[PDB]
Write an enzyme that holds these catalytic residues in place. Structure first.
Site, PDB file in Angstrom:
ATOM      1  N   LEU B  21       0.800  -1.242   0.000  1.00  0.00           N
ATOM      2  CA  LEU B  21       0.000   0.000   0.000  1.00  0.00           C
ATOM      3  C   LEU B  21       0.825   1.281   0.000  1.00  0.00           C
ATOM      4  O   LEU B  21       0.631   2.137  -0.866  1.00  0.00           O
ATOM      5  CB  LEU B  21      -0.956   0.087   1.193  1.00  0.00           C
ATOM      6  CG  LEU B  21      -2.433  -0.283   1.155  1.00  0.00           C
ATOM      7  CD1 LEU B  21      -3.049   0.213   2.453  1.00  0.00           C
ATOM      8  CD2 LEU B  21      -3.143   0.364  -0.024  1.00  0.00           C
ATOM      9  N   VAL B  29       3.321  -0.594   4.804  1.00  0.00           N
ATOM     10  CA  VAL B  29       1.919  -0.891   5.039  1.00  0.00           C
ATOM     11  C   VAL B  29       1.362  -1.646   3.831  1.00  0.00           C
ATOM     12  O   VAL B  29       1.507  -1.200   2.690  1.00  0.00           O
ATOM     13  CB  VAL B  29       1.105   0.391   5.288  1.00  0.00           C
ATOM     14  CG1 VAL B  29      -0.372   0.058   5.470  1.00  0.00           C
ATOM     15  CG2 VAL B  29       1.647   1.124   6.506  1.00  0.00           C
ATOM     16  N   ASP B 139       4.765  11.733  18.203  1.00  0.00           N
ATOM     17  CA  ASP B 139       5.064  11.737  16.773  1.00  0.00           C
ATOM     18  C   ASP B 139       3.825  12.074  15.920  1.00  0.00           C
ATOM     19  O   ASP B 139       3.638  11.520  14.842  1.00  0.00           O
ATOM     20  CB  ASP B 139       5.759  10.444  16.314  1.00  0.00           C
ATOM     21  CG  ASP B 139       6.442  10.605  14.961  1.00  0.00           C
ATOM     22  OD1 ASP B 139       6.703  11.769  14.572  1.00  0.00           O
ATOM     23  OD2 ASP B 139       6.715   9.589  14.281  1.00  0.00           O
TER      24      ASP B 139
END
Ligand SMILES: COCCNC(=O)c1ccc2c(c1)nc(-c1cnc(-c3ccc(Cl)cc3)[nH]1)n2CCOC
Ligand SMILES: COCCNC(=O)c1ccc2c(c1)nc(-c1cnc(-c3ccc(Cl)cc3)[nH]1)n2CCOC
Ligand SMILES: [Ca+2]
Lengths: 279, 284
Positions: B21, B29, B139
């Site tokens: 992906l 991912v 983050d």
């Protein structure tokens, strides 16, 4: 490791604006807003016995263990000497029962959304059957299939749920992994017809008797109009799901394999457009 | 007494149609479908060291413990000699970053939707800060704000996150964290808010990331003028106030998430429900 997530405990005083919503056999449902998290939540509390307290704790544990995209998400437990409740996400659009039958409120419920609800219900039950050990629902009804802000399904009410109204109950159960699919079949019939199963039947004992003799909610042009997408195919799924002989009823896996190509025929945007039409 | 829920272990072979992906500093991912559950899923994995297993298992454990409505739901952990990965729900609409900056694909992003995204990010982070002990994300960035089918927020990437007891951008990082804090996230959020309201890359003009770090330590911030934030922006003054207090040079001045929520609640109430659905249909 044996990675374990704990269910948070919620101080009763954190639940502001506690107000009644509805009452069922399971308990009373109230809305509220969490003081710290600043979200709307739902609370399911008893109407203070020693065993009725373990019931609430059993359900909470089931919801916490059975977490999944189509199961009502538990946010925590409110366990105090003065008050006992289950805290879950708030479902603004209520139950599937209200959507199908409040016809002046919802004159139109486009086919894509009905099929999406049917698919999600099945995905939810399939997940429970795939847990270890298998979890069986045993009380599926339109009243406990809840709908979030965009009308996605969240399954609830695990009171009669076991680790392996009577219109959704299979006939053998009047006196098993094949119970839920029976209930699913009735629900499917109800969704596609927007009719109450066995409408003309005054007494629930007449339903129980007719069902045990193999009678089932009516399938004709009046109940399931000829304009229903994938009509023939759905009628077959319904009819195998509520079959008299439990062994002839499909697993949820089979049920999903059959449904998947049906859902692919609806363009993604038609689901969104179906929702925007609703009040 | 103590109610515990265990994270399922998913055999690798159960993940069919495993297909790439996207990549980031966080890892790879891939999309897939669970063969038994019949749902589409996402899989964050590495693409072998035993040092990296603890990292993936750390994040998996956090996601499993920090479960909430605006936190990306973990479905299981895939832990085998061959493969290691975190299995989550699939978010068909990707990241806030792609929504903000794919301008030809998304010529308009309605104000109500933008505000709901901001409101939901804050709800997510607020929940993390209220856990016992508090969880700090450390983050936050638009790449880590994931969007579901109806553009609701799911916060992801807890790799750098910590319980209060890898080359990427520095634009969302408070200046005190540069050289060797519960006020880190709000700074990131403030930059996110500016980015959401402006659809502009922060420090657009500055090409060298070091120069940014200098600028930022020297008090500089992303430009708050008419050119970046037009006058016709719903509740502009209240928002700029929030952005400015959010990214203050002094951590003590920066507000809590609870405070932001208190400010944002009345703003969200000014938009009718219908506008959110309209915004999602406009984007399809
Ligand atoms: C005051 O107006 C009352 C009219 N009723 C409603 O509009 C309404 C709205 C939402 C409702 C509603 C009525 N009844 C329910 C409801 C029914 N059963 C539940 C429930 C079941 C199990 C658990 Cl553990 C929690 C909630 N909620 N919900 C969903 C609550 O979110 C979970
Ligand atoms: C083949 O390329 C297709 C183009 N890519 C996309 O349009 C796309 C779509 C969805 C994406 C996408 C690209 N990238 C992501 C994504 C980014 N980061 C994650 C993620 C982060 C942490 C975890 Cl634990 C899981 C997923 N997913 N998602 C969401 C996945 O559901 C979670
Ligand atoms: Ca477009």
């Amino acid at each position: 490791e044996a990675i374990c997530s704990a269910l948070p405990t919620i101080p009763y005083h954190k639940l502001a604006d506690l107000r009644y919503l509805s009452r069922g056999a399971s308990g009373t449902v109230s809305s509220a807003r969490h003081a710290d998290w600043r979200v709307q939540v739902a609370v399911k509390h008893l109407h203070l016995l020693d065993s009725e307290r373990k019931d609430v704790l059993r359900e909470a544990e089931i919801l916490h263990k059975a977490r999944f995209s189509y199961i009502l998400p538990i946010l925590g437990i409110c366990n105090e000497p003065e008050f006992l409740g289950i805290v879950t996400e708030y479902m603004p659009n209520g139950s599937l029962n209200e959507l199908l039958h409040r016809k002046t409120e919802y004159p139109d419920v486009a086919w894509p959304l009905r099929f999406r609800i049917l698919h999600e219900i099945a995905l939810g039950v399939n997940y429970l059957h795939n847990m270890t050990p298998p979890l069986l629902h045993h009380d599926l009804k339109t009243q406990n299939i809840l709908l979030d802000n965009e009308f996605h399904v969240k399954i609830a009410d695990f009171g009669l749920s076991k680790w392996r109204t009577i219109i959704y109950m299979p006939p053998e159960n009047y006196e098993s992994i094949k119970h839920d699919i029976y209930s699913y079949a009735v629900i499917t019939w109800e969704v596609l017809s927007r009719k109450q199963p066995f409408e003309d039947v005054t007494n629930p004992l007449q339903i129980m008797y007719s069902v045990s003799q193999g009678h089932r909610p009516v399938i004709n042009e009046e109940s399931l109009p000829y304009d229903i997408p994938h009509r023939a195919r759905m009628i077959s799924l319904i009819e195998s799901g509520w079959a008299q002989n439990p062994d002839e009823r499909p697993s949820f896996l089979k049920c999903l394999i059959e449904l998947e190509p049906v859902l692919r025929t609806f363009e993604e945007i038609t689901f969104l457009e179906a929702v925007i039409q609703l009040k």
